[PDB]
């Protein structure tokens, strides 16, 4: 849990183009902190193999992009 006094984990992202054009933002920065500006924008977040499409809501601010792109498949046994 990053200390609040340090601020957000800001990463270089192309937000201006996604706000003037509406294009999805494809990114591997799973550590990135979802800033309040991101709300409404569409992100494609790498999960190690694919890019998961996700739109950001107001209940996602503060969390990190990686939290919404699971990297493992649900476990199953050959019962």
């Amino acid at each position: 849990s990053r200390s609040v006094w340090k601020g957000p984990n800001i990463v270089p992202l192309p937000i201006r183009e996604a706000m003037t054009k509406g294009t999805p933002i494809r990114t591997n920065a799973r550590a990135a902190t979802i800033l309040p500006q991101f709300v409404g924008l569409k992100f494609q977040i790498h999960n190690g193999k694919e890019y998961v499409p996700i739109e950001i809501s107001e209940d996602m601010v503060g969390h990190k992009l990686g939290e919404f792109a699971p990297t493992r498949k649900r476990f199953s046994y050959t019962q």
Binding site: I54, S57, D59, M60, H63, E67, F68, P70
Partner: peptide, 12 residues
């Protein structure tokens, strides 16, 4: 419930 609604890893 909010964790499940937003689709976070913790919610799952």
């Amino acid at each position: 419930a909010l964790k499940r609604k937003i689709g976070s890893y913790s919610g799952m």
